[PDB]
């Protein structure tokens, strides 16, 4: 199942929330 | 990397801050 | 967690479900 | 909530009593 | 079920970029 | 200026719970 | 175009059924 | 255009990351 | 079907492009 | 509050977490 | 308005999936 | 770039080209 792939459309979304569109 | 690791467990966010440039 | 991540999706449905607020 | 609508699927009925 | 659906999610947003101004479902 | 692309984006996304 | 109808003003989730 | 709406939606989802429920 | 060629392994542009309309 | 704050200029992390509830 | 900043995290997912 | 795919729609070659 692509779990791993699912996540990382998330995490792509936090780390431009937390490090900010210039990082 | 990252996936492996914080898809694993949820990472805190200070954990992803570690991967800032 | 794929918990976490359907925790995203469900806040998701509940702003467009409920309105806002 | 995220319990529930996570475990079993939720809908939107079920939902709208959040609301 | 759950997996099922927060997948199909995903593959509409994807269907959403590479499908343009085609679309992909009415 | 991509505002109707974006909007779009959300809007495939409602239809997708709608249509379940 | 339910794209130039429901990014002018909010559709309903209802609205948004009758595509389905 | 519905822009009130589109930033709601993001924010509920920054809010579920930082606050979860 | 979409689901099971792409929720069971991961879709290429291209496998996914045969869903367009 | 913390539509207008948000929805007019970018909200960190930091930020939206004073809304927490 | 935040447009540029919303816009952006729609890219970022846009980028994640070709890339 | 945000500048050139905010203020106008980028496909996915374009998108592509952001990658290295
Ligand atoms: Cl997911
Ligand atoms: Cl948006
Ligand atoms: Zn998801
Ligand atoms: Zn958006």
């Not at chain 1, 199942?1 to 990082?23: D, I, M, P, T, W």
């Not at chain 2, 990397?1 to 440039?21: A, D, H, K, R, W």
């Amino acid at each position: 199942f692509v779990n791993q792939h699912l996540c990382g459309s998330h995490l792509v979304e936090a780390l431009y929330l937390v490090c900010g569109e210039r990082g | 990397g990252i996936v492996e690791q914080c898809c694993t467990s949820i990472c805190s966010l200070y954990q992803l801050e570690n991967y800032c440039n």
